[PDB]
RNA sequence: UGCAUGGCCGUUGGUGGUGCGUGGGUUGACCUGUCCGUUGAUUCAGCUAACGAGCGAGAUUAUCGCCAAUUAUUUACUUUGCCGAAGUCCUUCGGUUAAAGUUCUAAUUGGGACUCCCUGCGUAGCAGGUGGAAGAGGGUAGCAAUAACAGGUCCGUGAUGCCCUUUAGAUGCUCUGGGCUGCACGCGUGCUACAAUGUUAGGACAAUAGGAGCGAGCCUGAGAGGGUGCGCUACUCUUAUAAUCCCUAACGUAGUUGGGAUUGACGUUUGUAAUCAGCGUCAUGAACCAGGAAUCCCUUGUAAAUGUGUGUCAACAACGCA
């Protein structure tokens, strides 16, 4: 998208809607660098919820960093996507935060 | 557990703690549990505040006499020196060492001190027998540094005069400065 | 000449740098009375303190 | 060594449902909270069971705030429902102050048969 | 050109913080939610125009400590039995596909500790104690929110915009040689000492790493070194009988057998090269007698001493990481 001159709002909320509707607990999108002004300035677009700490980051959080070269300057693209655990799908075990009590 | 004697020589049957005085004796740590064949031990004494009392007193000296910066560690060195004091003490006078030792630990550590005017506070019995063993052993190494004389002897010279209350001693001289400063400031 | 107190109760701590305790004491001389004195080191209740001067209480609390 | 909001809010929800199980002893209740609730780790259940025990020896006593365990809900309903024989509102003379008698004149209901003053 | 930028990292600050949905307050910036005790902690407790969801904290991951199941007679050991050597009537060594194992050794699955227990203090919790391998986050690490610093890096990059260089007598690349090691002087991190709680001489237990380079044993030479190259693709073979400490002597308070800088020569290894590299040998034998005003680090297997590996490496550690 961002090669073909879409606004960064519309480019993120394309994919951040597409991630969540497909099936995921949260996602974050960062578009770091130089649009508009001489100074670079950071966009961050987030929905859902997004776990940042511990071991449990490594199991659940998918992420991917990159960059776009342009006429003007080098932007950085960066998309973190958190998953739901399946019952033996394709993670297995739930988070160490949560517990579930049985019904009587 | 019938003989029960220090270095395999001296005994704790003597030492008359009740006889020595009132107070002071308690933090002394010579009461049965403290007695051991060798003053070396696996200490666990710095865990919670007052556990330093429950260790033996002769060990507590051997730790003080572990300085400075070269003699750190090497306790196994220090318990030779304190042995070779306690031969020189015993075989000169004929008293056994532990009696004349604990009398030295009484009369060194000054009652009172300048808490930073400056005001003259009193002391705990714990902090007396601490600053007994410092001001003995401070004087020993300060004397023994450069002196052409073995430190086992220079311990034994300090340690006899501490019992008899003489101003030969680096201990019992230095209290009468520190106690008089507390009397002056007040 | 060299009198002997004993600590009834530790009220708290004092000094600018928190260096010193102070304590209610009942005289071991047995004359009787209670003196509120600032001790230096660390004190377990029931400890005995030798005082060069029995007179003057510390200041305030 | 404080118990966090997750292990408290579990341990109250355990005693909600399963007060029919459990005891004052820890080593029993530890083994209960495996079966009652799927928990990831070992350390979690020791701290859950540790508060479940704590609340039991509070419960051997007046009723704890913010917790309801089904036996007391049944017991409150019986303790609620019944109401003692007699109104308990009849003296039946009924004492009344001097000014409050003069009120019961002004309404138009003196000679009530309920007594006056002192 | 880091004052055009990407990423990565340090820092403010690893402190306890940060801000959404609906509701209420205010013309509005904005506030409330996010407020009398407790905790390392916006940790819990409870107040209450707020109620409810988050993220960080916690949980989790890794290891160290204690357990007993599961395996192991050619990668660890032990006991007993055999055959040796000495002792020479029962003690100690070395060997063994030889029978039984698992206390040491190796590493997977689980158990274990929760303020549960008792006593004081104030429900949340706190202090002490018993037991216990371990007791108050069991110890130590790892991971670590939002919001920013024109802090750092275009000398890490096929991460990069623009500027200029390609006039090749190049700012491309490469060969020989020299620099970054040049010294009237000022500061930072370190090392070795000033000795006798020592040095000198002789005698007597580790762990973690790495290795198709490590390099076995036996010869050669005072020494460094040199030759021959057995085992190992490693719990098997190897670097590899560590050093403070300990025990017998020598010295004797002196700039002294303390101290080992600076210089002269000979004997060598690594390398295309020793001119500024390291090792050895004999000589040379300095400043320093504990350091002014100032300042740094540290609470338990910690400080301090004491060595050993590893990173860089043909050769060279006073340095970093263990």
UniProtKB/TrEMBL annotation, chain A:
A molecular function (GO) term: structural constituent of ribosome
Keyword Ribosomal protein: yes
Keyword Cytoplasm: no
Region (Disordered): 89-104
Ranges of residues in domain Small ribosomal subunit protein uS3 C-terminal: 1-81
UniProt keyword terms in alphabetical order: Ribonucleoprotein, Ribosomal protein, RNA-binding
GO biological process: translation
GO cellular component: cytosolic small ribosomal subunit; nucleus
Family: Belongs to the universal ribosomal protein uS3 family.
Protein name (record): 40S ribosomal protein S3
Annotated organism of origin: Trichomonas vaginalis (strain ATCC PRA-98 / G3)
Section covered of the full-length record: 109 to 214 of 216
Automatic annotation (TrEMBL), chain B:
Keywords on record: Ribonucleoprotein, Ribosomal protein
UniProt keyword Iron-sulfur, yes or no: no
Gene3D superfamilies recorded: Ribosomal protein S7 domain (1.10.455.10)
InterPro entries: Ribosomal_uS7, Ribosomal_uS7_CS, Ribosomal_uS7_dom, Ribosomal_uS7_dom_sf, Ribosomal_uS7_euk/arc
Listed GO MF terms: mRNA binding; rRNA binding; structural constituent of ribosome
GO terms (BP aspect): translation
Small ribosomal subunit protein uS7 domain residues: 33-186
Domain of life: Eukaryota
Gene Ontology CC terms, in alphabetical order: cytosolic small ribosomal subunit; ribosome
Protein family (similarity comment): Belongs to the universal ribosomal protein uS7 family.
Name of the protein in its database record: 40s ribosomal protein S5-B, putative
UniProtKB/TrEMBL annotation, chain C:
Annotated GO CC locations: cytosolic small ribosomal subunit
GO biological process terms held by the UniProt record: maturation of SSU-rRNA; ribosomal small subunit assembly; translation
Swiss-Prot/TrEMBL keywords: Ribonucleoprotein, Ribosomal protein
Keyword Glycosyltransferase: no
Pfam families (UniProt xref): Ribosomal_S28e (PF01200)
Residues in coiled coil: none
Keyword check for Iron-sulfur: no
Recorded superkingdom: Eukaryota
Molecular function (Gene Ontology), one example: structural constituent of ribosome
UniProt family annotation: Belongs to the eukaryotic ribosomal protein eS28 family.
PANTHER family the record matches: 40S RIBOSOMAL PROTEIN S28, SMALL RIBOSOMAL SUBUNIT PROTEIN ES28
HAMAP family xrefs: Ribosomal_eS28
Name under which the protein is recorded: 40S ribosomal protein S28
TrEMBL record, chain D:
Keywords per UniProt: Ribonucleoprotein, Ribosomal protein
One Gene Ontology cellular component: cytosolic small ribosomal subunit
SUPFAM superfamilies attached to this UniProt entry: Rps17e-like
Stretches of the chain forming a coiled coil according to its record: none
GO MF annotation list: structural constituent of ribosome
Gene3D superfamilies: Ribosomal protein S17e-like (1.10.60.20)
Residues of the signal peptide: none
Biological processes, Gene Ontology terms: translation
HAMAP family: Ribosomal_eS17 (MF_00511)
Family: Belongs to the eukaryotic ribosomal protein eS17 family.
Identification of the protein by name: 40S ribosomal protein S17-B, putative
Species annotation: Trichomonas vaginalis (strain ATCC PRA-98 / G3)
Top-level taxonomy: Eukaryota, Metamonada, Parabasalia, Trichomonadida, Trichomonadidae
């Amino acid at each position: 998208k961002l090669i073909a001159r879409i606004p960064a709002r519309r480019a993120a909320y394309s994919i951040i809607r597409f991630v969540m509707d497909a099936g995921a607990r949260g996602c974050e999108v960062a578009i770091s660098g130089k649009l508009r002004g001489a100074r670079a300035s950071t966009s961050k677009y987030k929905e859902g919820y997004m776990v940042k700490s511990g071991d449990v980051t490594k199991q659940f959080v998918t992420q991917a960093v990159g960059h776009i070269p342009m006429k003007q300057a080098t932007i950085g693209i960066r998309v973190l996507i958190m998953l739901a655990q399946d019952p033996s799908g394709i993670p297995k075990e739930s988070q160490p935060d949560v517990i579930k009590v049985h019904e009587a | 557990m019938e003989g029960v004697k220090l270095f395999g020589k001296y005994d704790y049957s003597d030492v008359d703690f009740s006889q020595l005085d009132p107070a002071l004796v308690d933090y002394i740590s010579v009461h049965e549990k403290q007695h051991v064949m060798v003053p070396h031990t696996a200490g666990r004494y710095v865990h919670k505040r007052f556990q330093k009392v429950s260790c033996p007193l002769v060990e507590r000296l051997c730790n003080h006499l572990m300085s400075r910066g070269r003699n750190t560690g090497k306790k196994l060195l220090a318990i030779r020196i304190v042995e070779h004091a306690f031969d020189i003490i015993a075989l000169s006078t004929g008293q056994n060492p532990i009696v004349t030792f604990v009398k030295g630990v009484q009369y060194c550590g000054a009652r009172e001190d300048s808490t930073r005017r400056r005001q003259a506070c009193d002391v705990s019995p714990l902090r007396r027998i601490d600053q007994a063993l410092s001001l003995i052993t401070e004087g020993v190494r300060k004397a023994a540094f450069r002196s052409s004389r073995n430190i086992a002897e220079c311990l034994a010279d300090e340690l006899i005069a501490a019992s008899n209350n003489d101003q030969t001693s680096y201990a019992c001289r230095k209290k009468d400065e520190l106690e008089r400063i507390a009397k002056s400031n007040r | 000449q060299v009198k002997l107190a004993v600590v009834k109760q530790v009220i708290g701590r004092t000094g600018s740098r928190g260096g010193v305790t102070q304590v209610r004491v009942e005289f071991l001389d047995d004359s009787n009375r209670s003196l509120v004195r600032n001790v230096k080191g660390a004190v377990r209740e029931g400890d005995i303190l030798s005082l060069l001067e029995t007179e003057r209480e510390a200041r305030r609390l | 060594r404080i118990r966090t909001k997750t292990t408290k809010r579990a341990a109250r929800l355990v005693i909600e449902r399963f007060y029919g199980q459990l005891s004052f002893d820890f080593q029993d209740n530890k083994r209960v909270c495996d079966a009652v609730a799927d928990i990831p780790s070992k350390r979690m259940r020791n701290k859950i069971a540790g508060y479940v025990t704590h609340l039991m020896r509070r419960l051997e006593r007046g009723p704890v705030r913010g917790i309801s365990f089904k036996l007391q809900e049944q017991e409150r309903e019986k303790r609620d429902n019944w109401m003692p024989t007699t109104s308990k509102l009849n003296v039946p003379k009924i004492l009344v102050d001097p000014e409050t008698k003069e009120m019961l004149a002004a309404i138009g209901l003196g000679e009530m048969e309920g007594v006056e003053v002192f």
